[PDB]
Design an enzyme around this catalytic site. Structure first.
Site, PDB file in Angstrom:
ATOM      1  N   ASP A 219       1.267   4.752   2.475  1.00 43.60           N
ATOM      2  CA  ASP A 219       0.884   5.374   3.742  1.00 43.60           C
ATOM      3  C   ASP A 219       1.258   6.844   3.724  1.00 43.60           C
ATOM      4  O   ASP A 219       2.411   7.169   3.488  1.00 43.60           O
ATOM      5  CB  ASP A 219       1.645   4.691   4.892  1.00 43.60           C
TER       6      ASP A 219
ATOM      7  N   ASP B 212       0.839  -1.188   0.000  1.00 45.88           N
ATOM      8  CA  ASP B 212       0.000   0.000   0.000  1.00 45.88           C
ATOM      9  C   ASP B 212       0.883   1.249   0.000  1.00 45.88           C
ATOM     10  O   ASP B 212       2.105   1.140  -0.080  1.00 45.88           O
ATOM     11  CB  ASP B 212      -0.954  -0.022   1.219  1.00 45.88           C
TER      12      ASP B 212
ATOM     13  N   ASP C 133      -3.410   4.380   2.843  1.00 47.85           N
ATOM     14  CA  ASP C 133      -3.738   4.760   4.199  1.00 47.85           C
ATOM     15  C   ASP C 133      -3.440   6.241   4.394  1.00 47.85           C
ATOM     16  O   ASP C 133      -2.387   6.701   4.021  1.00 47.85           O
ATOM     17  CB  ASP C 133      -2.925   3.959   5.210  1.00 47.85           C
TER      18      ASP C 133
END
Ligand code: DUP
Ligand code: MN
Ligand code: MN
Ligand code: NA
Length: 327
Positions: A195, A193, A251
């Site tokens: 962040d 992902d 995120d």
DNA sequence: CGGCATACG
DNA sequence: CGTA
DNA sequence: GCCG
């Protein structure tokens, strides 16, 4: 070799990759069976090997290294002698390991859910798709997007993504900043992902910011999934690709500027590094660390930090840049 | 033997 | 329960 | 599973 991972540099690439990977399989398996203690020991032993200056070639080189007892030492011994550890291979080929890995990889599924599903007889992603009324909305998103989410995010993807987040953030609150954290800040070339940590230089201005950011990204058509006052968002974003796009996990976290060093430290990781740092703080220094601050429970006071450097100093630890926090 | 990080959604 |  |  000091006993805590936060007391030694750990680079991203190292000289004991095969050995550490084997110990991490055993760690992962321990977690799948609910044994957090054994997961920690295997992770810590693996991390010790990452921190070594050269390859382990003989068993005697483990003598006096922390977190190497009979079990971890036998794993290494077998790898050194035969190129393979029978226990590790048995785990790799267990139905239990493979299915728990498959299920826990799904966004919205943890160990407890995976285990229940396993006990119910479920084995494949199509098994879960055939009974979808039992899935949470989060799990449905996780399952729909699973293939794209299984593809590594490239460092070359992150730049264009940060630009779109910055645009939304700047409309939501002029002057607010976006900082890349997580694995990419530690020098990783890939990730599961991206962040991002968001703040504003005027304390208090960041209050209520994340909903505003999320509503704006949503209006741009970029949000395939999110949960929606809040300060962390676990999203799935639409990322452009040649003639198409792919789903990626992003995120977003907001912190006040007073807390930014603590949030930056926590969100930069690694996960094991932060666990070890918080353990060190409490057990060795009597201070309670989290991603908001550092508390002295005797004085009932919080340490004001202006930088990550401040935090390492307050804990009596030599500073480690993010690239040396790959525990 | 006890402890194993510590939060938010 | 999930998530970082 | 290991330190302490
Ligand atoms: O349980 C956790 C998970 C993450 N974290 C922190 C450390 C971690 O490096 C950071 C970002 O979490 P990710 O799950 O995104 N892992 P990371 O960015 O390190 O690697 P990747 O995303 O490539 O798996 O948040 C914790 O403190 N506890
Ligand atoms: Mn990440
Ligand atoms: Mn993340
Ligand atoms: Na999961």
């Amino acid at each position: 070799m000091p006993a805590y991972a936060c007391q030694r540099p750990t680079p991203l690439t190292h000289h004991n990759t095969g050995l550490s990977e084997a110990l991490e399989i055993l760690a992962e398996a321990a977690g799948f069976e609910g044994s957090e203690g054994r997961l920690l020991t295997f992770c810590r032993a693996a991390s010790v090997l990452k921190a070594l200056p050269s390859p382990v070639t003989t068993l005697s080189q483990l003598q006096g290294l922390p977190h190497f007892g009979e079990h971890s030492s036998r794993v290494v011994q077998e790898l050194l002698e035969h190129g393979v550890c029978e226990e590790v291979e048995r785990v790799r080929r267990s139905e239990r390991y493979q299915t728990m890995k498959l299920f826990t990889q799904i966004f919205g599924v943890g160990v407890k859910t995976a285990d229940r599903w396993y006990r119910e007889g479920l084995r494949t992603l199509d098994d879960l798709r055939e009974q979808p009324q039992k899935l949470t909305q989060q799990q449905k998103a996780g399952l729909q997007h699973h293939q794209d989410l299984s593809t590594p995010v490239l460092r070359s993807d992150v730049d264009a993504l940060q630009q779109v987040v910055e645009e939304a953030v700047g409309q939501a609150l002029p002057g607010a900043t976006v900082t890349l954290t997580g694995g990419f800040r530690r020098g990783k070339l890939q990730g599961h992902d991206v962040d991002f940590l968001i703040t504003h230089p005027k304390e208090g201005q960041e209050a209520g910011l994340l909903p505003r950011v999320m509503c704006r990204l949503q209006d741009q058509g970029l949000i395939l999934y999110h949960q929606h006052a809040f300060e962390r968002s676990f999203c799935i974003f639409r990322l452009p690709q040649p003639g198409s796009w792919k789903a990626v996990r992003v995120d977003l976290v907001v912190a006040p500027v007073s807390q930014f060093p603590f949030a930056l430290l926590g969100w930069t990781g690694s996960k094991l590094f932060q666990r070890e740092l918080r353990r060190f703080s409490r057990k060795e220094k009597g201070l309670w660390l989290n991603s908001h601050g550092l508390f002295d429970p005797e004085q009932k006071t919080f340490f004001q930090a202006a930088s990550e450097e401040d935090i390492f100093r307050h804990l009596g630890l030599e500073y480690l840049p993010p690239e040396q926090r790959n525990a």
